[PDB]
Write a protein that binds this ligand. Structure first.
Ligand SMILES: Cc1ncc(COP(=O)(O)O)c(CN[C@@](C)(CC(=O)O)C(=O)O)c1O
Ligand SMILES: Cc1ncc(COP(=O)(O)O)c(CN[C@@](C)(CC(=O)O)C(=O)O)c1O
Lengths: 396, 396
């Protein structure tokens, strides 16, 4: 019954992984996937984490099942990370958080929830976009259509075009926004541009679904949740699929949350009970480690304090690597002015390199970008910036 | 948009748990969920586990993403756990393992794979069965019909009504077997009976799906994989959804696997590549901790040795809790003969108690069993073995 099965095509992002872990060449550089790297090119375990792990280690008396939605204070700490301490969504008890296996697993369960207790049929995810939004949504029933986003010619956010294409969505449709650090492109909207969409989506009756996987990597933390917070004030319902894989360097422990906001307690209560059932039929309850760790660090002022410093380093290690990239680009003799790279936010940068350029790089040169020409700045190092900038500069 | 959403019914199993927590009566007992307990009544973190967590804390330099299918060694170790040291599925490369969030996640990943890469439209689960087999498959699309199993007058399993009801399953249908420790009831097929079913499904053209979540709790790790092995000898394609949450006491860390065996390497490879695609859109990759542990303990002969002893203890304590349950019952005032509780295997016993009886217990004596009258033996201790057995007897 399997004789018939087609060999699925390689994941555009996770394929590189293997493709790299096989290029036997010496100075092979991996600019693919979006995982941090320090000056040495390692993705280390955060210090606050190590400490939270020490604590747990000695303070854990059991491994007995979490709840369907996970660790309570993990949710509460998550909400305040999202909305903000005082916050009426919190003070009115409108939000309900389930802890999930990844921000990628927060998306799916929102989806399976939506497509099964809701009237939706379509979900709108920008162009371009993180290629797995499509797949997690189709896997749920839902069909995905695109809205205009990026002005490629001039490397920015084509707002008119964004707005005009959204106007063709229907009331009751779910429209997906990235909270900050647009993947790829890293072009995000201004606070102003965020309020507008907030107001529009209220008039047009769309249901905003936020993919929030990089709080803290562009600007700040309570500053990354700004757009998200402009919608919350206006709307009556929303869904945030949060992730703590990057900002807590917890990639393989799988930590994220699915926040469901509704008009009121009893409703969100009632709705949330369905979301729970949707998870129960997926993975049952969430993996305790990574979240026990995040709640601990966020629960403890010493650790939390350490943690915010550790993240503020990661962030700035990047803002730096942006500059150095363009600068070495020029001094190494490029034509295309790449100054736009500095305008972007997060681990990536839409390079503007042809698909066949990015193919030559992986072959003539060992350099590994995503086929969109997306490069992980956070994997560029003062030591590899030179061999890299020569490759890139040798294929233009 | 959520205004219309209906509140989901509480999980028959997982909602007893909320029921029990909110219960204020002091001498309250909880035979609900299937989580192991010790003489004192705690769900301790096994020793070899703390020892491995210590190794990890020390030796792990990173949190970087595991691959879609997770940790290799975990996989290779799981296969010898299921199949054998040098079983032909292993030396032939017929099998491929994916690390998944729990055994309820290996089940779902399989359902999504089947209902998308095969023609399967229905899955046959026994009567009775763990109530989430349905909810899981139905979420994949698949329809579940149900085969006879439990002969309730004589608390045995009539192979006949089981065979007969199955004769109706078509060829290309999925048949779901419990590797050992049937849930609930705890009745299992002899080896003879297992090979007869091995052969049957070989003729009738079924694709057996095995839910293996209690390896080691009936007789032993090998004596418990006999059925799965009689099958494995005969079939060309198989799917095993194994779990490590009980026998490694790793409940909230979510550790299990989805093993995919097919006729040859290229097939399984091809098939598996699509099973990977199905995981990529659920949770993306699996949570590292508990799998890291299991790999660690399983690939370290000392730790292994500790582990096997800790498992042998659990297993025997329950065995001890069974007869003590009979005997006490047996002369704490009972009339109904429950000696069959001893025939059963694993954490639970199918008490054959009126679902109105199981209501009186919980409401009049704080004793908590599931509405089927499934009681958790591994939650019975010498200390509560008397008030419990006094409750039962008051309501029968
Ligand atoms: C925009 C975006 N949203 C959500 C997720 C979900 O992440 P999580 O399950 O790991 O929480 C990612 C991860 N995407 C990465 C960083 C890796 C990937 O390809 O999955 C990326 O390279 O874009 C992401 O990039
Ligand atoms: C028959 C059966 N299959 C698979 C699983 C999956 O467990 P995992 O995801 O945790 O690996 C369980 C757990 N079922 C329990 C022990 C608990 C539950 O209801 O979830 C039960 O009480 O039967 C099980 O009982």
């Amino acid at each position: 019954m399997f004789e018939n099965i087609t060999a699925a095509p390689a994941d555009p992002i996770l394929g590189l992984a293997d493709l790299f872990r096989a290029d036997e060449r010496p100075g092979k550089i991996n600019l693919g996937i979006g995982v941090y790297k320090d000056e040495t090119g390692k993705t280390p375990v955060l210090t606050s984490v190590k400490k939270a792990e020490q604590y747990l280690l000695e303070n854990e008396t059991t491994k007995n099942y979490l709840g369907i939605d996970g660790i309570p204070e993990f949710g509460r700490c998550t909400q305040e990370l999202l909305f903000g301490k005082g916050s009426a969504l919190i003070n009115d008890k409108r939000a309900r958080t389930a802890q999930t296996p990844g921000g990628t697993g927060a998306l799916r369960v929102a989806a399976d929830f939506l497509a099964k207790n809701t009237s939706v049929k379509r979900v709108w995810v920008s162009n371009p976009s993180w290629p797995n939004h499509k797949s997690v949504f189709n896997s749920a029933g839902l069909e995905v259509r695109e809205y205009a986003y990026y002005d490629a010619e001039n490397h920015t956010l084509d707002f008119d075009a964004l707005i005009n294409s959204l106007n063709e969505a229907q009331a009751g449709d779910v429209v997906l926004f990235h909270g900050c650090c647009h993947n790829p492109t890293g072009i995000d909207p201004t606070l102003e541009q965020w309020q507008t969409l907030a107001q529009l989506s209220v008039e047009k009756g769309w249901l905003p679904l936020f993919d929030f996987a990089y709080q803290g990597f562009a600007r700040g933390l309570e500053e990354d949740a700004e757009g998200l917070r402009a919608f919350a004030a206006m709307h009556k319902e929303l869904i945030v699929a949060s992730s703590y894989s990057k900002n807590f360097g917890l990639y393989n422990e799988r930590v994220g949350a699915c926040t469901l906001v509704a008009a009121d307690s009893e409703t969100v209560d009632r709705a949330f009970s369905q979301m729970k059932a949707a998870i129960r039929a997926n993975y049952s309850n969430p993996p305790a480690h990574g979240a026990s760790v995040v709640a601990t660090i966020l629960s403890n002022d010493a650790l939390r304090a350490i943690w915010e410093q550790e993240l503020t380093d990661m962030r700035q290690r990047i803002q730096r690597m942006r500059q150095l990239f363009v600068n070495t680009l020029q001094e190494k003799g490029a034509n295309r002015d790449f100054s736009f790279i500095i305008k972007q936010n997060g681990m990536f940068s839409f390079s503007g390199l042809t698909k066949e350029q990015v193919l030559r790089l992986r072959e003539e040169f060992g350099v590994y970008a995503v086929a969109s020409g997306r490069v992980n700045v956070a994997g560029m190092t003062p030591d590899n910036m030179a061999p890299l900038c020569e490759a890139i500069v040798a294929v233009l």
